[PDB]
């Protein structure tokens, strides 16, 4: 396996598996500090899903919330985790998203997701790729089918991996006193692009469902 990413992705997935039990740990009808964030993020899933997917947003609530909150916790492990002293001879210790493979996995997941919706809910024989509006629109089918997953992934992946490198490229020259607005802009936009992959996934499901 590609170890340099997998080793740290294991402990980030451990953070995920613990947040899986955070649900069943504390029941609060009125959630005070911290859990109100959980309810607000559930509301955020409601927002993006009901806004873009359409009707069967709720069985896709899991599939959108997973990538959204996972980009959240991976931004956490990338920047906000104190990792100055730790040293690995296998490679840099930045984030789970350091490898292309995680983002192409999210890509294929979203792709087969809207393909699944468009094959089940619509007909099996033909879906939006079939050339109904104008029968000479096969280049549109080819291009969009070929470009959606990989660049869908690249949109997030580029910024996240770029900052994951830029942080150590900055510390290699100047200590942490200078790179901190860079950390700020990164922690700013890394959750936005999480939202972006989420809403574009949702829009592709809506395309499949229409």
């Amino acid at each position: 396996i590609h170890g340099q990413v997998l080793i740290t992705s294991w402990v980030v997935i451990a953070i995920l598996l613990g947040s899986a039990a955070i649900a069943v740990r504390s029941p609060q009808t009125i959630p005070t500090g911290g859990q109100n964030f959980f309810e607000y993020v559930l509301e955020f899933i409601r927002d993006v899903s009901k806004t873009q997917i359409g009707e069967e947003y709720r069985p896709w609530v899991p599939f959108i919330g997973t990538m959204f909150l996972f980009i959240f916790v991976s931004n956490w492990s990338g920047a906000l985790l104190p990792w100055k002293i730790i040293q690995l001879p296998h490679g840099e210790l930045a984030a789970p998203t350091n490898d292309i493979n995680t983002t192409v996995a999210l890509a294929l997941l979203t792709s087969v997701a809207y393909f699944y919706a468009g094959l089940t809910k619509k007909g099996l024989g033909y879906f939006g790729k079939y050339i109904q509006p104008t029968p000479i629109l096969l280049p549109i089918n080819i291009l969009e089918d070929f470009t959606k997953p990989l660049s869908l992934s690249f949109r997030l992946f580029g910024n996240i991996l770029a900052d994951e490198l830029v942080v150590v490229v900055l510390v290699s020259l100047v200590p942490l006193v200078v790179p901190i607005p860079v950390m700020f802009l990164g922690l700013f936009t890394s959750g936005i692009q999480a939202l972006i992959f989420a809403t574009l996934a949702a829009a592709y499901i809506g395309e499949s469902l229409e």
């Binding site: 590609h2 995920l16 598996l17 899986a20 609530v61 899991p62 990538m67 493979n101 192409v104 996995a105």
Partner: peptide
């Protein structure tokens, strides 16, 4: 094809962990 191998690996990984987290 090593990178597609790691892609399919993380695909199943998210499959299982996604489901077991995000149902309950």
């Amino acid at each position: 094809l090593t990178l597609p191998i790691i892609m399919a690996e993380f695909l199943f990984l998210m499959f299982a962990l996604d489901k077991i987290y995000y149902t309950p």
